[PDB]
Nucleic acid binder design. Structure first.
Ligand SMILES: [Mg+2]
Ligand SMILES: [Mg+2]
Ligand SMILES: [Mg+2]
Ligand SMILES: [Mg+2]
Ligand SMILES: [Mg+2]
Ligand SMILES: [Mg+2]
Ligand SMILES: [Mg+2]
Ligand SMILES: [Mg+2]
Ligand SMILES: [Mg+2]
Ligand SMILES: [Mg+2]
Ligand SMILES: [Mg+2]
Ligand SMILES: [Mg+2]
Ligand SMILES: [Mg+2]
Ligand SMILES: [Mg+2]
Ligand SMILES: [Mg+2]
Ligand SMILES: [Mg+2]
Ligand SMILES: [Mg+2]
Ligand SMILES: [Mg+2]
Ligand SMILES: [Mg+2]
Ligand SMILES: [Mg+2]
Ligand SMILES: [Mg+2]
Ligand SMILES: [Mg+2]
Ligand SMILES: [Mg+2]
Ligand SMILES: [Mg+2]
Ligand SMILES: [Mg+2]
Lengths: 172, 146, 257
RNA sequence: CCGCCCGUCGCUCCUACCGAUUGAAAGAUAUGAUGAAUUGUUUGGACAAGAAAAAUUUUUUCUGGAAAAACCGUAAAUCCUAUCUUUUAAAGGAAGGAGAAGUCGUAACAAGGUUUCCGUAGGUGAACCUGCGGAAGGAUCAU
RNA sequence: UUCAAAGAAUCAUUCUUUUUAAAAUCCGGAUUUGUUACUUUGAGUAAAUUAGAGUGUUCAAAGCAAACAGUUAAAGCAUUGUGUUUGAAUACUAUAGCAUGGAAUAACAAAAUUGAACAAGCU
RNA sequence: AACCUGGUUGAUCUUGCCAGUAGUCAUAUGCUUGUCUCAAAGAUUAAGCCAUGCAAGUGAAAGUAUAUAUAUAUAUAUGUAGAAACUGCGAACGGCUCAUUAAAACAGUUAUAGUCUACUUGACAUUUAUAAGGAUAACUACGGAAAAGCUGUAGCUAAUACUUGCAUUAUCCUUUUGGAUAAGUAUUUGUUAGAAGGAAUUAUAACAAAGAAGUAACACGUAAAGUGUGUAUCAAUCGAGUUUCUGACCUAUCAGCUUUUGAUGUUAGGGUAUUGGCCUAACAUGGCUAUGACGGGUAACGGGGAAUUAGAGUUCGAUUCCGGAGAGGGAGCCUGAGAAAUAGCUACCACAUCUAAGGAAGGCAGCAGGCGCGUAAAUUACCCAAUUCUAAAGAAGAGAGGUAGUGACAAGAAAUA
């Protein structure tokens, strides 16, 4: 299923002469969603287990500027450069932009210096700040939850963030 | 316009926030062009800018097409000896190569391509160095022994 | 079903085993181990076809059962254990010590050797890994990992390695004039000095090796085993001393006897 | 030269062709329909181990979990077409080859008794004849 | 499009040494200079077969063995004890790929409604 | 041994075929055959069908024995065997055939900086304990079914089955002693820092987060304190998957193909052990082709090779080795390091066996053997002795393999004076 059964670039039918060799395995997609955590183990090749997350929430999210990370419930999926169907179904994949319950980062900031190891000097964006004010912040996912079994991700920043906002843009 | 896709075209291996844009050397004496080091453009499968290491064969060709996006065709023209007739005969083979927009390549231009991993259904190569060259018929028809 | 192959057919056996076409259908199939089957040799062959201590596989097995044959000083009861290029065999009852070497043909001889020299073995490093706690480990052709190796050891060079204890004695860099043995194509037994190394960019690094008849021959760097500094070898070489004669010369030599 | 021989027309044998017959047959793909089994997920919840109360029984919560079901996804098989390939029948038709001293002529070989032959068109029992333009492989290397 | 020239050996010929321009490199001396085809050396390849070396399988087809000394020891070599010499070569493993010496023969690239080389000056 | 003779004629010289002529690890068949050596042999037709038997098991210190037997030493102590079964490992090798398959496979040549890898080897570890928890087999008793390698119930009991779960090292001060700070292997994410390799987003180091699995609740009694079994990561190895380049027969009375059905590419993903239209979505309109694409044919598995050649070549290569594929036909899974396994399973189709008619099992292209087909091909033999494999690894198994039997396939030597 990872295999041939496909035209030959010249557009000639490869007359098949070989079954399907198990090492051409194409086991089917875990459309991993939001919800309470729930993950199965699929047994890949040499007992190499991999963790089909099927529901998720509490991924590890990073804040790249400051280079730190925190575990947060993720409250909604809002964009998917693959397809809008996935976002409709609220399915987490390796480049989904999603919304983090983003109090943790704020709390961390407060603990460290001010209110909304240390190479601080950068001191936050405007857009990001605004986002924080509502509690909830946009962030890519970066793990492939379907393989790794974790919704690990990172906060979307400056230029990329702007681009994603534009993409989202509402309007009509 | 750099960001043309539905996704943000980033550049893995860049490192934006901390540290003192990303390109690499690719080796075998193929000089990274100015357009890779300068000149923003994101390419996952650029030899220099992206994350594909060229390794295995290197073979010169001659471009037939630019029609695909960031992807080129090169016919290798060569001579298959036939022992019965102790003579040769022109033969050929169209290698598809990935380009990367550091190289502006019109047809008939000589290129050299390194191997690299399977980038798509057929493109296993990428162009490392583009000699200029000029052509008058169709590149299709130019034999250049090489 | 289809997985790995357990058997070896006696014609498909690598020539320098020197098996028969008759005298069997199969060959021994070296166990996985510290050597590459095409350049190893199982213990069975050693016991039965080289020393001729055994007539049969059965006898070899019996011998092994008495824990009396050691290969690199720790015992082995696996009949088809691969012995390979440099390894000292200590048959305990005879108090014989062999070291495997190459002939001037491709063939393994067991060399015969003193107690004193037996205690070490040469080992060429192949890879030099960094591992946890920035500690470097060399990996020898003996499929053996030497940890905490002396920093000046580089990827191709040999290492005089003790057997009683896992630690190393001294190392011999891959220099321009370093006494070398070969271990692959054509020039296999050959022993030379090295004239020159090519150091090709993407390819195999070919090297040229002057003999003591001053006959230069080339070889891949892959399959060359450093054995000395220009003066003296750090091991006892066989009687021929790696001087692969011409065919005519060999014939003449044969005649004069 | 009482030589050679040409074609129709009969007669016998064999070969392949055309052939109505939606001819037939098997196989191959391609479409579509239904669709066994089943990976995965979802629903399930026979029960087997806990937690709650009464003196072994009652009600409620947490675990693992069989059957059964639903949805994608692999997808056998069967049926229906379509197309193609392959053998294969057929009244009749029309060739060919073989044979037999058969019928009718005399076409060709000699200036073969209209030189021959070409291409083309029409003709005619049959060889063939005729027209037009070619050729000499002419019966003229020549005024 | 660098043709040639001169010296020594041998039985008119063969094999060898030396220099005749220009540019870069090295402490007046000394040493790098288009691409590919082609060719030469290699490298790297399973053996069986094939060619082929050795070996009286009684011959031979074979096989990959064997030979040697002795009515039972000498001789060797080992510090009474231990047989000894060995052999199972080599070449073939494309037409492609790898490195490689190359002077010929081929290509191609370099090259004027203008092309690049230096010395000075300015940025 | 670089070879030619007869045939057109009344004769001649050519062209030209026919005929002869030799060989074939090339089949058949006819007649004939006293030795010996060697030895192909149901490929060609039907990858047609199969009665019976056999072809993968495994215990010699070393998981589990109140089935049980037994010998010592003083009713206990050790012991020594041990049917059975649980556990473990193997059964993915081997063997067979050649139907498929014509840039596919295969050969050489790369590549894996794109991966997986049991056994074997070597390195070698991290956030009640004088010893933990049940619950299961064989077994006992009661059963059922015509039958099946069918299993029901109740009661036990082990395990190396299954499940828990107990200091020291590196960074700073003092004179080897006494304090301070840390302390997760893969794996994953984000942030950086960077002894090789031609080339690194490599090794590695740090920071912020998660995080499997593990580090002996095991068994012998060994060696000159050892071993077996198990175990995280790394490397080696036995490999495997993909992959680069180049290389194939006949056909143009196959010339245009491929693209809604992924054709060509880009992006993002999903999936994979990893790369990849491998799959999904979105977007391009590509890609191949007279140097033969795409079809068709092959009485095609590929190659190493075989025959025959002076030299070229031509034909063959089912068939000793390597590779591929397949186990009646497709398809689908489980186990496992490795299978899309077929003497594993599920299903359908096509064959087909037993049945008390309810059901049940079955797959010789393993070895023999039989029918069929055919021009066309051997014994239902003996053995594990050799060669090897597997195992709890001398000690057991092995139709793998070998030895004979049949054998004018071939090949060699050689009577009949
Ligand atoms: Mg199979
Ligand atoms: Mg007249
Ligand atoms: Mg007439
Ligand atoms: Mg006339
Ligand atoms: Mg008229
Ligand atoms: Mg008329
Ligand atoms: Mg003839
Ligand atoms: Mg006799
Ligand atoms: Mg058959
Ligand atoms: Mg057979
Ligand atoms: Mg044992
Ligand atoms: Mg038992
Ligand atoms: Mg097999
Ligand atoms: Mg366990
Ligand atoms: Mg699509
Ligand atoms: Mg076939
Ligand atoms: Mg074959
Ligand atoms: Mg056949
Ligand atoms: Mg069958
Ligand atoms: Mg199957
Ligand atoms: Mg069977
Ligand atoms: Mg079946
Ligand atoms: Mg049979
Ligand atoms: Mg026969
Ligand atoms: Mg045996």
């Amino acid at each position: 299923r990872d295999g041939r059964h496909k035209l030959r670039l010249t557009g000639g039918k490869k007359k098949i002469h070989k079954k399907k060799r198990k090492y051409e395995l194409g086991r089917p997609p875990s459309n991993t969603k939001l919800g309470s955590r729930q993950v199965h183990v699929v047994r890949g090749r040499g007992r190499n287990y991999k963790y089909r997350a099927i529901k998720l929430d509490s991924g590890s999210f990073s804040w790249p500027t400051f280079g730190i990370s925190k575990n947060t419930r993720i409250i909604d999926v809002v964009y998917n450069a693959s397809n809008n169907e996935l976002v409709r179904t609220k399915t987490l994949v390796k480049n989904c932009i999603v919304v983090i319950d983003s109090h943790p980062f704020t709390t961390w900031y407060e603990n460290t210096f001010g209110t909304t190891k240390i190479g601080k000097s950068k001191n936050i964006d405007p857009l990001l700040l605004e986002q924080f004010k509502q509690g909830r912040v946009l962030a890519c996912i970066s793990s492939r939850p379907g393989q790794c079994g974790k919704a690990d991700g990172y906060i979307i920043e400056g230029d990329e963030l702007l681009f994603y906002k534009r993409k989202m843009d509402k309007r009509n | 316009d750099v960001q043309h896709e539905r996704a943000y075209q980033k550049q893995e291996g860049a490192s934006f926030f901390n540290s003192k844009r990303y390109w690499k050397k690719v080796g075998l004496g193929f000089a990274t062009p100015k357009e890779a080091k300068e000149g923003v453009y994101v390419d996952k499968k650029c030899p220099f800018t992206g994350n594909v290491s060229i390794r295995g064969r290197i073979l010169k060709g001659m471009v037939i097409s630019n029609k695909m996006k960031r992807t080129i065709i090169i016919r290798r023209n060569y001579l298959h000896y036939v022992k019965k007739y102790n003579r040769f005969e022109k033969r050929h083979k169209n290698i598809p190569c990935h380009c990367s927009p550091c190289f502006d390549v019109k047809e008939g231009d000589i290129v050299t391509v390194g191997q690299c991993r399977p980038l798509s259904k057929t493109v296993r190569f990428n162009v490392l160095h583009v000699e200029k060259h000029q052509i008058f018929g169709s590149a299709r028809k130019q034999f250049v022994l090489f | 079903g289809k997985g790995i192959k357990k058997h070896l057919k006696r014609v498909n056996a690598p020539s320098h085993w020197m098996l028969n076409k008759m005298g069997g259908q199969y060959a021994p199939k070296t166990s996985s181990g510290p050597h590459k089957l095409l350049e190893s040799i199982p213990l069975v062959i050693l016991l039965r076809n080289r020393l001729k201590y055994a007539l049969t596989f059965d006898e070899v097995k019996m011998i092994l059962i008495q824990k009396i044959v050691k290969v690199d000083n720790k015992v082995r009861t696996d009949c088809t254990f691969p012995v390979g290029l440099m390894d000292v065999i200590h048959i305990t009852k005879s108090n014989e010590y062999f070291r495997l070497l190459y002939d001037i043909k491709g063939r393994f001889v067991p060399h015969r050797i003193t107690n004193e020299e037996s205690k070490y073995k040469l080992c060429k490093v192949k890879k030099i890994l960094l591992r946890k706690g920035r500690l470097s480990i060399a990996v020898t052709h003996d499929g053996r990992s030497i940890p905490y190796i002396h920093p000046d050891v580089k990827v191709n060079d040999t290492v005089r390695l003790d057997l009683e204890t896992g630690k190393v004695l001294e190392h011999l860099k891959f220099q321009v004039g370093s006494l070398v043995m070969v271990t692959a194509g054509h020039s296999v037994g050959r022993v030379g000095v090295i004239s020159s190394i090519d150091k090709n960019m993407g390819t195999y690094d070919i090297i040229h090796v002057k003999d003591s008849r001053n006959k230069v021959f080339a070889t891949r760097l892959s399959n060359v085993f450093v054995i000395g500094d220009n003066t003296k070898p750090y091991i006892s070489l066989p009687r021929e001393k790696g001087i692969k004669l011409d065919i005519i010369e060999e014939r003449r030599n044969r005649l004069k006897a």
